C-alpha cells in the first residue's frame, strides 16, 4: 500500500499520520525527527596564517664591494650600502677606513606552527540535508539515518520510506566563508595572489603542504646605523593577527532559525525551515482486518478542560458502545488540535480520555476512534505563565472557529444588518413595481 504525507521540519514535534485503507482498520503512524544536519560542499581557495621574517647574518666586506643577487623567496629584499665601519667588538673589524660595504637581505616565510594555527577560505555551494527520524507504529520503534532527497530509501519492519526533498532552498552560509578553529564567518576574502599588507590574507597558500607562499607584507630594509653590526628594517605587522581581533561576530552567534553551526564537517545542525515530503509503502501484514477490530457506535465527544498553552493543556473524553475489547487508533483531522496518543484501549465500559494541545480560544476538530467519527468543540482559556523553557506542541493556528463565542457575535450582528437590508430592498422593490404600473 502506497501512502504520502508531509511532515514539518522541526526537531521534536510529534507528527502522526493516519492511513485509511479499505478492508482494514485505520492505522496511525507516529514519526518525528530527532536531529538534522545541513552540509555545504566546500572548495578550498587558500590557507592563511601568520608569517615569519627570516633575517640572516649580514655580509661585510672589508676593503671591497658586493652585488645584489635576486632570489626565488617570497617578498625577498636585498641591498648594499656603500661606506661602513662596523666596530664589531673590541675592535673595528675592518682595517679599512671608507671602502667597506654591507650586504643586507631578508625575506618572508611561513610560521613554524601554520599547520596547527591557520584559517581556511572556502566557497560554499548547494548543501545536502541529512536527518535522523524515529518511526513508531504497531509494535516497532526504531530510529534511522536518512538523506533528505528523493534518493535514499530505508526499511523499518518491512515498510519502505523515502523522505523527499526539503521544500525550502534556504541556507545560512554565503558564497565565501572563512573557517577558523570552531567558528564560521560569512566573509569576503581577497582574491588569490592579490592580498594586501596588514589585512587578512597578506600571505596566502593553496594548501597546508603547498609550496607557493604568496606574500605581500611591505617589507623594507634600512641603512645600518654608523658604528654597529645590525640589519634594520620595517614591515607591516601580521594580518592574521589583525583579523584575530577585528574579525567580527561569527555565524555561530547570529544564525536564523536557531541553526547550530558546527565543527570540522561544516554543517548547520537543527535549523527549522520547510517541510519534509515522505512516501511510504506499507506491507499487507501491518494492518488489521475490520472483522478483527472492535466496532464503535454512538461515539460522542465532550471536552473536560481546555487551556491553550504550549504543552498538552486540554482533556477530552469519548463515550461509545462497543462489542469487544480491543485497540483503536485515534486521530485529529484538523491541525488546530494535536493529540498526544496514537492508540487507545477500548473496553465495554465505554469511556476513554485523551490529551490534546491547541493555541486557539475556541478549537473545533473531528476526532476518530477505530471506526468512529465525532466532533469536539471547546472553549480554552489563556495561560498565566509568560515564559516557558520548551517549544509549543502544536501548530500555531489561532483563528477562532465559526460558531465560537467571538464569531457568533459577528454572525448575529451580520444577520441583523442583512435582515434590515433585505427588508429595505423588498420595500423599495414592491413600491417601485406597484407605482410603475
Amino acid at each position: 500500500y502506497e501512502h504520502s504525507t508531509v511532515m514539518p521540519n522541526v526537531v521534536g514535534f510529534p507528527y502522526k499520520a493516519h492511513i485509511e485503507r479499505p478492508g482494514y482498520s485505520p492505522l496511525t503512524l507516529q514519526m518525528q525527527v530527532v536531529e538534522t544536519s545541513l552540509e555545504p560542499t566546500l572548495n578550498l581557495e587558500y590557507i592563511t596564517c601568520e608569517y615569519k621574517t627570516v633575517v640572516p647574518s649580514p655580509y661585510v666586506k672589508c676593503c671591497g664591494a658586493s652585488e645584489c643577487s635576486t632570489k626565488e623567496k617570497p617578498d625577498y629584499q636585498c641591498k648594499v650600502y656603500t661606506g661602513v665601519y662596523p666596530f664589531m667588538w673590541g675592535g673595528a673589524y675592518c682595517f679599512c677606513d671608507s671602502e667597506n660595504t654591507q650586504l643586507s637581505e631578508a625575506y618572508v616565510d611561513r610560521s613554524d606552527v601554520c599547520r596547527h594555527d591557520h584559517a581556511s577560505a572556502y566557497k560554499a555551494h548547494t548543501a545536502s540535508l541529512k536527518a535522523k527520524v524515529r518511526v513508531m507504529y504497531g509494535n516497532v520503534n526504531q530510529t534511522v539515518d536518512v538523506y533528505v532527497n528523493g534518493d535514499h530509501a530505508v526499511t523499518i519492519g518491512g515498510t519502505q520510506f523515502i523522505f523527499g526533498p526539503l521544500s525550502s532552498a534556504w541556507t545560512p552560509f554565503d558564497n565565501k566563508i572563512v573557517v577558523y578553529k570552531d567558528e564560521v564567518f560569512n566573509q569576503d576574502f581577497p582574491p588569490y595572489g592579490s592580498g594586501q599588507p596588514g589585512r587578512f590574507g597578506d600571505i596566502q597558500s593553496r594548501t597546508v603542504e603547498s609550496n607557493d607562499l604568496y606574500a605581500n607584507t611591505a617589507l623594507k630594509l634600512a641603512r645600518p646605523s654608523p658604528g654597529m653590526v645590525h640589519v634594520p628594517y620595517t614591515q607591516t605587522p601580521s594580518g592574521f593577527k589583525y583579523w584575530l581581533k577585528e574579525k567580527g561576530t561569527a555565524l555561530n552567534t547570529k544564525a536564523p532559525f536557531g541553526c547550530q553551526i558546527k565543527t570540522n564537517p561544516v554543517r548547520a545542525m537543527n535549523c527549522a525551515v520547510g517541510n519534509i515530503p515522505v512516501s511510504m509503502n506499507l506491507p499487507d501484514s501491518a494492518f488489521t482486518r475490520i472483522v478483527e477490530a472492535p466496532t464503535i457506535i454512538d461515539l460522542t465527544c465532550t471536552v473536560a478542560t481546555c487551556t491553550h498553552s504550549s504543552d498538552f493543556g486540554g482533556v477530552l473524553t469519548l463515550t461509545y458502545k462497543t462489542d469487544k475489547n480491543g485497540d483503536c487508533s485515534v486521530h485529529s483531522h484538523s491541525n488546530v488540535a494535536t493529540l498526544q496518543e496514537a492508540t487507545a484501549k477500548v473496553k465495554t465500559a465505554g469511556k476513554v480520555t485523551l490529551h490534546f494541545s491547541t493555541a486557539s480560544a475556541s478549537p473545533s476538530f473531528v476526532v476518530s476512534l477505530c471506526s468512529a467519527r465525532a466532533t469536539c468543540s471547546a472553549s480554552c482559556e489563556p495561560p498565566k505563565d509568560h515564559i516557558v523553557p520548551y517549544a509549543a506542541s502544536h501548530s500555531n493556528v489561532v483563528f477562532p472557529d465559526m460558531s465560537g463565542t467571538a464569531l457568533s457575535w459577528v454572525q448575529k450582528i451580520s444577520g441583523g444588518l442583512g435582515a434590515f437590508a433585505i427588508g429595505a430592498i423588498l420595500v423599495l422593490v414592491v413600491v417601485t413595481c406597484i407605482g410603475l404600473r
Binding site: 504550549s310 515564559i387 516557558v388 434590515f420 430592498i425 423599495l428 413600491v431
Partner: protein, 101 residues
C-alpha cells in the same frame, strides 16, 4: 531582552546556551462581553485587531446608511405623486406609515 513566540537563546560565560519561549498570555476574556473579547485579541495581536475592528465598523455604518437611504427613496417615490396633484387628498392610513404632513 525580547522573547517572542519564535523563541530566544542566551549564552552567559562558559555555560551551555539556554533557550526560552513565550506563551500566548494576554489580558481580557476570550468568552465575555464584546469589549472583553476585543481586549483579549488586542493583547495578542494589536495592529491586526485594530484594523479588523475599524474595517467592520466602517462596513456596518455603510450598510446602515445605505438601508436608511433606500427607505428614504422608497418613501419619496410612494408619497411624491400626491404632492403634484392639485387636490392632494392623501389617505390618512398611508400618511401614518410614511409620515405624510
Amino acid at each position: 531582552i525580547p522573547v517572542p513566540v519564535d523563541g530566544m537563546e542566551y549564552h552567559w560565560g562558559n555555560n551551555d546556551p539556554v533557550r526560552l519561549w513565550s506563551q500566548l498570555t494576554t489580558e481580557g476574556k476570550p468568552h465575555g462581553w464584546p469589549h472583553q473579547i476585543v481586549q483579549y485579541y488586542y493583547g495578542l495581536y494589536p495592529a491586526a485587531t485594530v484594523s479588523a475592528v475599524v474595517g467592520m465598523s466602517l462596513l456596518a455604518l455603510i450598510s446602515i446608511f445605505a438601508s436608511c437611504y433606500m427607505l428614504v427613496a422608497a418613501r419619496s417615490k410612494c408619497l411624491t405623486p400626491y404632492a403634484l396633484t392639485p387636490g392632494a387628498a392623501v389617505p390618512w392610513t398611508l400618511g401614518i406609515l410614511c409620515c405624510a404632513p
